[PDB]
Design a protein around this ligand. Structure first.
Ligand code: STE
Ligand code: UI8
Ligand code: PLM
Length: 572
């Protein structure tokens, strides 16, 4: 079975010529684009010889072998990959394992910098195949562990924005907003894939399955616990393998899970019809982002089996993870409106309760009212979402972001100004995205988007530690991470920042700037305003903000004239 030829079929020549490009670009991050093009063309030509004759020359070697063979022929030594060239002296599965250990992950590559809209649409027109292929090359060499089929999914959406906006009226009003959402979603996926690999190693796979049972029970409410438990086991085995870095081994386990799910749709979900009729690449991908199946009508209460029962301590003791997983599965399938972390708080609370009750003379009397403990935990994110979405409606996205700047700078003023501006604007975005949902779908939307922003804040703070309270909340636990950040009181031991005079100086270049960039600096100064006087309160801050609005809108030169009056007047 010639694997290079079989891969070429059922996957398509176009997807083959793109995955081979992403694959080699993830290893040879230093080699130029045109050098990569020949290698993809050479592998494509060689694959075509195996397509025309499966038992031809060098067509009997498997995927890792021909990959490793072609990779060890590029004068890899002395060209950055000196150590990676030493992998050639090994053989499978040591040579490929050696290749994975030498992915740079942090290559000293310049910021990509997008060209002008007219330049891109012209380059996209005159040479579309070369234009898009350079896009895959430049992104794959900077994200060496980004799952290649997933990176290919973004390339299609990248091309869809160019075909529509390049033949339009105001192209920049069409293309540029699509590219930013595309680039933002690309960073979110990259950080999500890493957060899940780090969560697997830091906290162990016992807690990883708990996250998977809850999410899968919400996704597949019409599935038995045994099916959900098997899907969680296989899904964990896939993530454990895909975090090693090997694309080929990750893809095969990822395709076997989709095949099993499509063969057992009648015992998993009713919403996997059009999902399972997609090709190999999209099948595994679409199932990951599948809508929750309809909840089974007339589901009994969890009072019977988990709090009343007759004897439940015996059931919990023999399997202190299965019985907790059955409670999590039954609670999650009934509450698709809860976040995954909320359901884990209820289970962990139900866990700590049983161990204190089953360690008592009358365990039943100890756990007789365990469900009263869940009400405060369910109402805590609900009140936070409603209090913040309502404050978002009466403010708009911008003024909601500024209310978050003041609130979070006063909590941790030690955080750098560019990080406080970035995190607060992204936290305002989850308001513009999730408050447009009803209460039945607001908590999961917030959980998914907050997990992206809160992790981005942590990885920035991890590389440059600054606050102990940010460090504790960032390394506590992924279940208690959000309640940790929301429980931060304002910093009382913080000494006010010194009045840097130039920081509050503006120069009328902000008059004609950029709607984002103009308010980036308008929000940067607001952070520096709060850092200088951390005891200003909203009334005085709304006064200085109102005084700045009249100073900026009118005097737009005078920025030094009226500016000096503002600084002295604000000193109050
Ligand atoms: C975001 C891209 C990650 C790439 C590696 C993913 C490895 C594991 C993904 C395999 C899942 C296949 C679909 C499983 C169906 C479960 C749906 C769900 O994830 O909630
Ligand atoms: N992702 C995500 C997350 C976060 C935190 C913790 C954990 C986790 N995990 C698990 C699962 C299941 C299903 C789907 C997805 C997922 B992940 O990986
Ligand atoms: C910089 C500190 C960020 C703190 C984030 C507080 C934002 C609160 C908004 C409502 C939180 C909703 C969380 C739902 C998921 C969960 O149960 O934690």
């Amino acid at each position: 079975k010639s694997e290079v030829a079989h891969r070429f079929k059922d996957l398509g020549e176009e997807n083959f010529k793109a995955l081979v490009l992403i694959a080699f670009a993830q290893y040879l991050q230093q080699c130029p684009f045109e050098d990569h093009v020949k290698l993809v063309n050479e592998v494509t030509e060689f694959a075509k010889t195996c397509v025309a004759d499966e038992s031809a020359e060098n067509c009997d070697k498997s995927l890792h072998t021909l990959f490793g063979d072609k990779l060890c022929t590029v004068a890899t030594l002395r060209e950055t990959y000196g150590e990676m060239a030493d992998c050639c002296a090994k053989q499978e599965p040591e040579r490929n394992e050696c290749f994975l250990q030498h992915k740079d992950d942090n290559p000293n590559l310049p910021r990509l910098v997008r060209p002008e809209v007219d330049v891109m649409c012209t380059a996209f027109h005159d040479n579309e195949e070369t234009f898009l292929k350079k896009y895959l090359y430049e992104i794959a060499r900077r994200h060496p562990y980004f799952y290649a089929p997933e990176l290919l999914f973004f390339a299609k959406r990248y091309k869809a924005a160019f075909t529509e906006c390049c033949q339009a009226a105001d192209k920049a009003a069409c293309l540029l907003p699509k590219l930013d959402e595309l680039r933002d979603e690309g960073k979110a996926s990259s950080a999500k894939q890493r957060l899940k690999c780090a969560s697997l190693q830091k906290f162990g796979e016992r807690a990883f399955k708990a996250w998977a049972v809850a999410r899968l029970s919400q996704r597949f409410p019409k599935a038995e616990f045994a099916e959900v438990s098997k899907l969680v086991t296989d899904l964990t085995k896939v993530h454990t393998e895909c975090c090693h870095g090997d694309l080929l081994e990750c893809a095969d386990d990822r395709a076997d899970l989709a095949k099993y799910i499509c063969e057992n749709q009648d015992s998993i979900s009713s919403k996997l019809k059009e999902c399972c009729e997609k090709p190999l690449l999209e099948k595994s991908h679409c199932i990951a982002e599948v809508e929750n199946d309809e909840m089974p009508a007339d589901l009994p209460s969890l009072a019977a089996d988990f709090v009343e029962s007759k004897d439940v301590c015996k059931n919990y003791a023999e399997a202190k993870d299965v019985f907790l997983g059955m409670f999590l599965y039954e609670y999650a399938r009934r509450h698709p409106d809860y976040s995954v972390v909320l359901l884990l708080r209820l289970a962990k609370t139900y866990e700590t309760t049983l161990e204190k009750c089953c360690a008592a003379a009358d365990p039943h009397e100890c756990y007789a009212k365990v469900f009263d403990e869940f009400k405060p935990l369910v109402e805590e994110p609900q009140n936070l979402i409603k209090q913040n979405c309502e404050l978002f409606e009466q403010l708009g996205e911008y003024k909601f972001q500024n209310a978050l700047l003041v609130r979070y700078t006063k909590k941790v003023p030690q955080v750098s100004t560019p990080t406080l501006v970035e995190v607060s604007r992204n936290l305002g975005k989850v308001g513009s995205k999730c408050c447009k949902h009803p209460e039945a779908k607001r908590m999961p939307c917030a959980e998914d988007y907050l997990s992206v922003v809160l992790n981005q804040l942590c990885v920035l703070h991890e590389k440059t530690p600054v606050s102990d309270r940010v460090t504790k909340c960032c390394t506590e636990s992924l279940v208690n991470r959000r309640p940790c950040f929301s429980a931060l009181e304002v910093d009382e031991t913080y000494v006010p920042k010194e009045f840097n005079a130039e920081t509050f100086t503006f120069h009328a270049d902000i008059c004609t700037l950029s709607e984002k960039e103009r308010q980036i600096k308008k929000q940067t100064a607001l952070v520096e305003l709060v850092k200088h006087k951390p005891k200003a309160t909203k009334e005085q801050l709304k006064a200085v903000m109102d005084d700045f609005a009249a100073f900026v809108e009118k005097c737009c030169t005078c920025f030094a004239e009226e500016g000096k009056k503002l600084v002295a007047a604000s000193q109050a």
